[PDB]
Design an enzyme around this catalytic site. Structure first.
Site, PDB file in Angstrom:
ATOM      1  N   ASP A 169       0.849  -1.186   0.000  1.00 46.00           N
ATOM      2  CA  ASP A 169       0.000   0.000   0.000  1.00 46.00           C
ATOM      3  C   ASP A 169       0.887   1.240   0.000  1.00 46.00           C
ATOM      4  O   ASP A 169       1.538   1.546   1.003  1.00 46.00           O
ATOM      5  CB  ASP A 169      -0.930  -0.009   1.210  1.00 46.00           C
ATOM      6  CG  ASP A 169      -2.027   1.029   1.111  1.00 46.00           C
ATOM      7  OD1 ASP A 169      -2.091   1.735   0.084  1.00 46.00           O
ATOM      8  OD2 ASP A 169      -2.828   1.141   2.061  1.00 46.00           O
ATOM      9  N   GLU A 189      27.422  13.793  19.957  1.00 44.15           N
ATOM     10  CA  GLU A 189      27.482  13.937  18.511  1.00 44.15           C
ATOM     11  C   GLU A 189      28.422  12.891  17.933  1.00 44.15           C
ATOM     12  O   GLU A 189      29.490  12.627  18.490  1.00 44.15           O
ATOM     13  CB  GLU A 189      27.950  15.339  18.108  1.00 44.15           C
ATOM     14  CG  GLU A 189      28.127  15.531  16.614  1.00 44.15           C
ATOM     15  CD  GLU A 189      28.533  16.944  16.251  1.00 44.15           C
ATOM     16  OE1 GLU A 189      27.883  17.895  16.731  1.00 44.15           O
ATOM     17  OE2 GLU A 189      29.501  17.106  15.482  1.00 44.15           O
ATOM     18  N   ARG A 196      29.382  33.887  15.303  1.00 46.14           N
ATOM     19  CA  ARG A 196      28.537  33.223  16.324  1.00 46.14           C
ATOM     20  C   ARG A 196      27.208  32.825  15.685  1.00 46.14           C
ATOM     21  O   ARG A 196      26.385  33.731  15.451  1.00 46.14           O
ATOM     22  CB  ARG A 196      28.313  34.153  17.521  1.00 46.14           C
ATOM     23  CG  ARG A 196      27.615  33.490  18.699  1.00 46.14           C
ATOM     24  CD  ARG A 196      27.148  34.496  19.730  1.00 46.14           C
ATOM     25  NE  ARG A 196      27.525  34.106  21.082  1.00 46.14           N
ATOM     26  CZ  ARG A 196      28.020  34.931  21.997  1.00 46.14           C
ATOM     27  NH1 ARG A 196      28.204  36.209  21.711  1.00 46.14           N
ATOM     28  NH2 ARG A 196      28.334  34.474  23.197  1.00 46.14           N
ATOM     29  N   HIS A 201      23.771  19.690  11.240  1.00 43.52           N
ATOM     30  CA  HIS A 201      24.498  20.477  10.250  1.00 43.52           C
ATOM     31  C   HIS A 201      24.899  19.626   9.053  1.00 43.52           C
ATOM     32  O   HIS A 201      25.398  18.507   9.206  1.00 43.52           O
ATOM     33  CB  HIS A 201      25.745  21.103  10.879  1.00 43.52           C
ATOM     34  CG  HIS A 201      25.475  21.868  12.138  1.00 43.52           C
ATOM     35  ND1 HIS A 201      24.231  22.365  12.457  1.00 43.52           N
ATOM     36  CD2 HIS A 201      26.297  22.230  13.152  1.00 43.52           C
ATOM     37  CE1 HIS A 201      24.296  22.996  13.616  1.00 43.52           C
ATOM     38  NE2 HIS A 201      25.538  22.928  14.058  1.00 43.52           N
ATOM     39  N   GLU A 259      26.077  16.049  10.643  1.00 47.91           N
ATOM     40  CA  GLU A 259      26.565  16.103  12.020  1.00 47.91           C
ATOM     41  C   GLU A 259      25.381  16.004  12.973  1.00 47.91           C
ATOM     42  O   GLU A 259      24.966  16.998  13.578  1.00 47.91           O
ATOM     43  CB  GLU A 259      27.359  17.386  12.272  1.00 47.91           C
ATOM     44  CG  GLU A 259      28.381  17.711  11.201  1.00 47.91           C
ATOM     45  CD  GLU A 259      29.151  18.982  11.499  1.00 47.91           C
ATOM     46  OE1 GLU A 259      28.691  19.775  12.347  1.00 47.91           O
ATOM     47  OE2 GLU A 259      30.218  19.189  10.886  1.00 47.91           O
ATOM     48  N   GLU A 266      28.530  24.570   4.815  1.00 51.21           N
ATOM     49  CA  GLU A 266      27.800  23.973   5.926  1.00 51.21           C
ATOM     50  C   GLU A 266      26.535  24.775   6.190  1.00 51.21           C
ATOM     51  O   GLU A 266      26.597  25.984   6.427  1.00 51.21           O
ATOM     52  CB  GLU A 266      28.665  23.906   7.184  1.00 51.21           C
ATOM     53  CG  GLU A 266      27.949  23.293   8.377  1.00 51.21           C
ATOM     54  CD  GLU A 266      28.718  23.450   9.670  1.00 51.21           C
ATOM     55  OE1 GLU A 266      29.053  24.598  10.028  1.00 51.21           O
ATOM     56  OE2 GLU A 266      28.983  22.429  10.335  1.00 51.21           O
ATOM     57  N   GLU A 316      28.602  16.900  23.447  1.00 55.21           N
ATOM     58  CA  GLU A 316      28.171  18.214  23.006  1.00 55.21           C
ATOM     59  C   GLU A 316      28.056  19.155  24.207  1.00 55.21           C
ATOM     60  O   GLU A 316      28.331  18.782  25.349  1.00 55.21           O
ATOM     61  CB  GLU A 316      26.857  18.103  22.237  1.00 55.21           C
ATOM     62  CG  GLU A 316      26.625  19.218  21.235  1.00 55.21           C
ATOM     63  CD  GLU A 316      27.608  19.175  20.087  1.00 55.21           C
ATOM     64  OE1 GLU A 316      28.087  18.071  19.761  1.00 55.21           O
ATOM     65  OE2 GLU A 316      27.907  20.242  19.514  1.00 55.21           O
ATOM     66  N   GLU A 369      23.170  15.263  16.291  1.00 55.55           N
ATOM     67  CA  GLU A 369      23.330  15.309  17.737  1.00 55.55           C
ATOM     68  C   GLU A 369      22.097  14.703  18.388  1.00 55.55           C
ATOM     69  O   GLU A 369      20.976  14.903  17.912  1.00 55.55           O
ATOM     70  CB  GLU A 369      23.527  16.743  18.231  1.00 55.55           C
ATOM     71  CG  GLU A 369      24.833  17.375  17.800  1.00 55.55           C
ATOM     72  CD  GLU A 369      24.714  18.869  17.583  1.00 55.55           C
ATOM     73  OE1 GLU A 369      23.929  19.514  18.307  1.00 55.55           O
ATOM     74  OE2 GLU A 369      25.408  19.401  16.692  1.00 55.55           O
ATOM     75  N   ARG A 383      23.521  25.086   8.867  1.00 57.15           N
ATOM     76  CA  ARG A 383      23.364  24.771  10.279  1.00 57.15           C
ATOM     77  C   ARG A 383      21.923  24.827  10.761  1.00 57.15           C
ATOM     78  O   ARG A 383      21.671  24.555  11.938  1.00 57.15           O
ATOM     79  CB  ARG A 383      24.219  25.719  11.124  1.00 57.15           C
ATOM     80  CG  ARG A 383      25.713  25.571  10.910  1.00 57.15           C
ATOM     81  CD  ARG A 383      26.433  26.843  11.295  1.00 57.15           C
ATOM     82  NE  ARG A 383      25.866  27.426  12.504  1.00 57.15           N
ATOM     83  CZ  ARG A 383      26.178  27.048  13.736  1.00 57.15           C
ATOM     84  NH1 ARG A 383      27.070  26.098  13.962  1.00 57.15           N
ATOM     85  NH2 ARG A 383      25.581  27.637  14.766  1.00 57.15           N
TER      86      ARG A 383
END
Ligand SMILES: NC(=O)CC[C@H](N)C(=O)O
Ligand SMILES: NC(=O)CC[C@H](N)C(=O)O
Ligand SMILES: [Mg+2]
Ligand SMILES: [Mg+2]
Ligand SMILES: [Mg+2]
Ligand SMILES: [Mg+2]
Lengths: 5, 443, 443, 5, 5
Positions: free
Chosen positions: B52, B195, B315, B244, B131, B332, B188, B133, B334
């Site tokens: 199905d 991670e 940051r 990420h 990556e 990357e 982490e 976590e 994030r």
């Protein structure tokens, strides 16, 4: 269709 | 072609397997499967198994639809935790219409179609390294998850130590035994958060490895009396969980993102990909963050991205360019969380990057001045914009954007929106204990 | 002028009161008060008491500001539950600047200013009758509220019956003893939900009666081991609590909303008031529903309004015109909840109606075709529009509308916006058990 | 300013 | 930055 509710 | 039919038959005979789980992934990202005895294996390899297909639509399914179960030979994996009464093996399967055509509502088939478009434009492969976590919680007496973390660790800390326990070590050891390419594994920022990093493979192989990794981690954590969760933000005031994605685009020559003569040692293809990724980020934010809890992670102060900007060192930027170059050049993203469907996220990201390359868009200048310093008005003057703050706004942005719709397909787009609008409504009309503790005696 | 200073002194002497609670209402609607011995009563009647006016701003107060405490003589009420060691009396007080000017940040002073504007336009009084509904919950061993209702009653049902208990009967009896004009009292649709109706008084008197009614009901319910709550939606899947406002505008001749020769026996003033109320409803929805829990009540299927429309007989209209005419002609607004500040709600409603009268706007045709029948798109073609679905959208609508800002005043508007934005941010970043129940195990 | 938070 | 507080 909607068994979540 | 890593395996053939004869190889699969030989493996089934020699390892003494009596059960095969033909598995696939639905729209919501839940791993589903049909279980067949080994005696049916030949039929399974003849692409004659019917099932199905409406289950792919999830809970918003209406009408039963028959569909084939074309398996993938290269995904043959034998589980080790099967005792002696016959072993269990799995193969990720493709979904095909009864008229011998791949199903448009299958996320894997959609990703294959997008990869075909990319190959048509001139590239060879789309390497991805995730990556993920995850959080570990202690189980109760009734084997139910609790809110108590397994350890009060820190970022890159040697918290679990030796002398037993160390569930991360056991998980990585069994993953290595099962045939996984594990690069590294660490603790982490949040207590009880771990991670594990993968090697960079193809898009489809990376997504399959992500699904298998989730399944294996959950099973092994349950083995040691623990609950492994991939919720983006299980707890308030603590760091969330992210997935990420480090993506690189390859051609016949080599890495298409690398150019020794370009600014930042980045090719024009990489800049076009950045421009495409940033232009439509507000569009695919819904796909990359599909749960209500996901947008609880996208808050300032916990290193999760909150503004549409890219940087090499900042940051919590939305897109980060790692310092590694050469064949390791990559971009990357994030904003992705472990709750997202890997196939849909890869499809929409590839579509955005491909559109950016085709349109040759110029990316905005990178920001390195701590955008968190200014207010919303002081940064809205520049090209910095906010990500959607709730699932509903993200759903509206999806319904506005057309390129993401083209990258998802009509079937997947319609069913995804339907299920997510239901999720929003259910959450909107619910009464939470927060309100019964803020307005109970007060009002 | 119902009482004079000498009358107050005589009452204090004869009833043997030793404590006076000079009370007022802040922006958030919480009743606050300064407590003085009877020996200071003379000074209290001289308008010489100083206090910190910043408390009116609520939790968002920053700088201490000295302000006077002009009391109202007509609001003298002696509480009956004071034992024999001296009785307790209260008077609602006005807030005045040290330069002998009423404080702009006081909701009562703002309502007085709006009433002055209305009198300037030509009208005499703004009669209001509220219909507050409240829930009764059983207390625990530690005198803490639980989630268990006091009775499983029904709409207009004789559920509490005789032979003890019947907290509604005791409440109405003590309210009558205290000097309240109670029209009727009955059981609401939800179990444990009760409604008590008032007589129609002036705007200021009605708001004061609302505050006193809340205080008295809470105290009496606590007396009988119960918790009386005015939360708009304490429970999910059950009818919410509303505070429907029946408003009428009067002039020298009589009721300004009544006209025997007009359509529906309604004057042109009434139609202009309807047009003003409907035009700015999206604007003052934030003021009339100032809590997050409030918009959980504004959902279809529980008789709460959800669309901007008016009717004489319909399933949950935003504005309802009762069949009574003559001096009893009035317009009922049903979107108000008991959590709202009565003074701010009356101020914004009066401002909207006054603007409608001044602009002579034509109201839309009433709807009686069960607007719930069609979808959102099928009714958006006509003049039917949706109320804001969350407190953030309502705050945005407030920040857009200018007439409501003028009716609130700059001080009240700024402080209300600040407090409500803090409340929205606090709710948005929280992690609720709903999210864990929906994703902890799945993901 | 922020006792709630 | 400061998760100690
Ligand atoms: N140190 C880190 O970069 C962790 C980031 C954070 N855990 C996230 O989910 O985004
Ligand atoms: N019967 C009724 O009209 C009750 C209406 C509902 N209790 C409300 O708060 O709107
Ligand atoms: Mg990390
Ligand atoms: Mg990273
Ligand atoms: Mg009622
Ligand atoms: Mg009513």
């Amino acid at each position: 269709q909607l068994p979540r509710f | 072609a890593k395996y053939t039919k004869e190889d699969i038959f030989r493996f089934a005979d020699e390892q003494n397997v009596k059960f095969i789980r033909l598995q696939f992934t639905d729209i919501l990202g839940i791993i589903k499967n049909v279980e067949i005895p080994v005696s049916q294996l030949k039929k399974a390899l003849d692409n004659k198994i019917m099932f199905d297909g409406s289950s792919i639509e999830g809970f918003v399914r209406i009408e039963e639809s028959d569909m084939y179960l074309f398996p993938d030979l290269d995904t043959w994996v034998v589980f080790p935790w099967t005792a002696e009464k016959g072993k269990v093996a799995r193969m990720i399967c493709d979904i095909y219409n009864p008229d011998m055509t791949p199903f448009a509502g299958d996320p894997r088939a959609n990703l294959k179609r997008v990869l075909k478009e990319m190959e048509e434009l001139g590239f060879t492969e789309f390497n991805l390294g995730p990556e993920p976590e995850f959080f570990l919680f202690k189980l109760d007496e009734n084997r139910r998850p609790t809110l108590e973390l397994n350890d009060s660790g820190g970022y890159f800390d040697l918290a679990p130590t030796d002398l037993g326990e160390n569930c991360r070590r056991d998980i990585v050891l069994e993953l290595e035994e099962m045939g996984f390419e594990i690069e590294a594994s660490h603790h982490e920022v949040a207590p009880g958060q771990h991670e594990i990093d993968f090697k960079y493979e193809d898009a489809i192989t990376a997504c399959d490895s992500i699904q298998t990794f989730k399944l294996v981690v959950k099973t092994i954590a349950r083995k040691h009396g623990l609950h492994a969760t991939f919720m983006p933000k299980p707890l308030f005031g603590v760091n969330g969980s992210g997935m990420h994605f480090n993506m690189s685009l390859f051609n016949e020559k080599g890495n298409a993102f690398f150019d020794e003569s370009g600014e930042l040692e980045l090719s024009q293809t990489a800049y076009h990909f950045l421009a495409g990724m940033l232009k439509h980020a507000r569009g695919y934010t819904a796909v990359t963050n599909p749960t209500i809890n996901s947008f609880k992670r996208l808050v300032p102060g916990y290193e999760a991205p909150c503004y549409i900007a890219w940087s090499g060192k900042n940051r919590s930027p939305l897109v980060r360019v790692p310092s590694s170059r050469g064949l390791s050049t990559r971009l990357e993203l994030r904003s992705v969380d472990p709750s997202a469907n890997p196939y849909l996220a890869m499809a929409v990201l590839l579509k955005a990057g491909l559109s950016g390359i085709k349109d040759e868009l110029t990316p905005p200048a990178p920001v390195d001045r701590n955008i968190y310093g200014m207010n919303e008005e002081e940064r809205e003057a520049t090209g910095i914009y906010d990500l959607p703050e709730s699932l509903g706004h993200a759903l509206i942005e999806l319904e506005k954007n057309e390129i993401i719709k083209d990258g998802l397909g009509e079937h997947i787009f319609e069913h995804f929106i339907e299920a997510k609008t239901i999720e929003c409504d259910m959450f909107r009309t619910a009464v939470h204990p927060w309100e019964r503790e803020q307005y109970l005696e007060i009002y």
